[PDB]
Amino acid sequence: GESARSLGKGSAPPGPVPEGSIRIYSMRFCPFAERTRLVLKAKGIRHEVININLKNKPEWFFKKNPFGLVPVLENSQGQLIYESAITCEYLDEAYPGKKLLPDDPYEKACQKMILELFSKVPSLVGSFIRSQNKEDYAGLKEEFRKEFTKLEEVLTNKKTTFFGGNSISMIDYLIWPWFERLEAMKLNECVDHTPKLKLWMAAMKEDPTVSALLTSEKDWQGFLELYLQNSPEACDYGL
Amino acid sequence: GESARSLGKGSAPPGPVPEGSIRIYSMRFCPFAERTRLVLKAKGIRHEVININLKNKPEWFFKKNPFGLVPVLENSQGQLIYESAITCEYLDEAYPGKKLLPDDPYEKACQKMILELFSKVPSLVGSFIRSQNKEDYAGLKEEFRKEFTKLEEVLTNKKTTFFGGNSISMIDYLIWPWFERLEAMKLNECVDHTPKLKLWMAAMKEDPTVSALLTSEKDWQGFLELYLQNSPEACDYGL
Numbered sequence: 160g161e162s163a164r165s166l167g168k169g170s171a172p173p174g175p176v177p178e179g180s181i182r183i184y185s186m187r188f189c190p191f192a193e194r195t196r197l198v199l200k201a202k203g204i205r206h207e208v209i210n211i212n213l214k215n216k217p218e219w220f221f222k223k224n225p226f227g228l229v230p231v232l233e234n235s236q237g238q239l240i241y242e243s244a245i246t247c248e249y250l251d252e253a254y255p256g257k258k259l260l261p262d263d264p265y266e267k268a269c270q271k272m273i274l275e276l277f278s279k280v281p282s283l284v285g286s287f288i289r290s291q292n293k294e295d296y297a298g299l300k301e302e303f304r305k306e307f308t309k310l311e312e313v314l315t316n317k318k319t320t321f322f323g324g325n326s327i328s329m330i331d332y333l334i335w336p337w338f339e340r341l342e343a344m345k346l347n348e349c350v351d352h353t354p355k356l357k358l359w360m361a362a363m364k365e366d367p368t369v370s371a372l373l374t375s376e377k378d379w380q381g382f383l384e385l386y387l388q389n390s391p392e393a394c395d396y397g398l
Numbered sequence: 399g400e401s402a403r404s405l406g407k408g409s410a411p412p413g414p415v416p417e418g419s420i421r422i423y424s425m426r427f428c429p430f431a432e433r434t435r436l437v438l439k440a441k442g443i444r445h446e447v448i449n450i451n452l453k454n455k456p457e458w459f460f461k462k463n464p465f466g467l468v469p470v471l472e473n474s475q476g477q478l479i480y481e482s483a484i485t486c487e488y489l490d491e492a493y494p495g496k497k498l499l500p501d502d503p504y505e506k507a508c509q510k511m512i513l514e515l516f517s518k519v520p521s522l523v524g525s526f527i528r529s530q531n532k533e534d535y536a537g538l539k540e541e542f543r544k545e546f547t548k549l550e551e552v553l554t555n556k557k558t559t560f561f562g563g564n565s566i567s568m569i570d571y572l573i574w575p576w577f578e579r580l581e582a583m584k585l586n587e588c589v590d591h592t593p594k595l596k597l598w599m600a601a602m603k604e605d606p607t608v609s610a611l612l613t614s615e616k617d618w619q620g621f622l623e624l625y626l627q628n629s630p631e632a633c634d635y636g637l
């Protein structure tokens with residue numbers, strides 16, 4: 160439990176990444192970094208995690224990513240890779256095991272097109288934070304439904320359980336972390352008129368990788384409570 | 399000249415793409431679609447162009463891309479690919495000739511990270527359109543310089559003429575179309591304190607692919623004049 164505690168302002172910069180492992184600079188409740196962690200787990204990649212206190216960042220972390228954002232991968236050769244979708248594609252290419260992206264140029268482009276379709280959803284988390292009452296909440300639900308109908312159309316067209324076929328693949332993991340938090344946001348009704356999307360969510364929760372990393376509603380709310388209180392302890396909720 | 403004229407509202411949907419060619423739905427002055435055209439030319443890919451009148455779109459074009467945006471690739475097998483960066487990566491993978499993206503997972507990720515670094519520049523075209531006087535213009539220049547300093551740092555770190563090395567590669571073509579329009583926007587002073595970036599621009603203009611597709615300042619201004627007048631003839635400036 161204690162080894163997961165975040166590194167913040169004044170922490171010593173970590174040592175080199177050992178041969179045979181890759182490191183991810185992450186935060187336990189960041190959906191972008193969850194993408195990378197899903198991919199690490201799905202591909203069976205040996206790794207270490209350093210959590211970053213994003214409310215109280217170490218100065219040395221800007222040497223890992225000049226933008227100060229997680230996720231960041233660092234390997235034994237000293238190479239640094241950031242931007243969540245880039246870290247995921249890098250891992251899929253650089254490591255053996257289950258290929259998460261198809262080899263076919265067209266089918267890979269399709270996955271990336273679905274990812275572009277999804278692009279408005281992460282910024283609706285900001286809309287969620289700024290929603291203060293029942294009227295804001297009604298409008299927010301409508302904003303989520305609008306985006307979710309687009310994803311429903313993809314699953315209708317394909318007639319598969321997942322966004323890349325009948326097997327879980329990269330695209331599913333790239334979109335999953337925002338769906339993971341719907342119940343905690345009280346936005347689970349927004350999939351009510353998207354039945355294929357609703358079944359997709361149930362199938363995702365049964366995926367061994369997703370299940371291994373899933374954070375409970377209570378933990379989501381614990382984190383959120385502290386994060387909106389602007390606590391430097393938010394990132395270490397539950398330790 | 400006349401074959402380049404755009405298809406608009408009421409035009410007949412085009413026939414199938416012939417075997418041996420790929421089609422791009424484009425517009426002659428769209429920088430996103432210029433990315434794809436640069437890649438088609440650089441890789442020596444046989445193709446046909448259908449220009450879309452973006453101020454007066456054919457209803458059938460939404461069957462090619464539900465979002466109604468260029469570029470869109472359509473091949474002889476009926477597959478449709480859109481989103482400019484996706485069309486480019488697709489072409490690099492699907493076709494023979496010069497590989498524009500490196501094979502190495504890390505160096506490919508680096509190109510994509512530079513692309514993410516560039517992400518604010520296309521939206522500064524909107525800032526440009528909304529700039530109405532000399533005070534707005536001063537602020538606009540400062541906004542461009544801020545982004546350009548980030549790219550200057552990439553070239554300083556690498557000590558190469560281009561963003562992916564000493565040879566032109568995918569990343570250069572992905573960012574080029576916005577730099578092509580700097581002189582016409584009267585923003586060429588914004589590279590004055592970024593000397594490596596300024597030399598990059600001069601080297602790009604000498605690239606045979608870039609040179610083959612480059613549009614003159616006068617044509618840029620012709621298009622812009624008509625586009626801001628909201629003309630349905632803007633897209634066909636010069637015919």
Ligand SMILES: *S(=O)(=O)Oc1ccc2nc(-c3ccc(Cl)cc3)cc(C(=O)O)c2c1
Pocket residue numbers: 186188189190213214284285288340343344379380382383386
């Ligand atoms: S910060 O840590 O720099 O960035 C950040 C990380 C994670 C965030 N998660 C949420 C969130 C968490 C739980 C629930 Cl139920 C809803 C939303 C929100 C935000 C945010 O934008 O405030 C996060 C920011």
Ligand SMILES: *S(=O)(=O)Oc1ccc2nc(-c3ccc(Cl)cc3)cc(C(=O)O)c2c1
Pocket residue numbers: 425427428429452453523524527579582583618619621622625
């Ligand atoms: S529209 O055609 O749907 O989209 C579109 C295409 C191209 C644009 N080009 C410019 C532009 C052209 C020349 C110069 Cl000097 C500066 C800017 C602007 C815009 C825009 O956002 O208005 C374009 C829109």
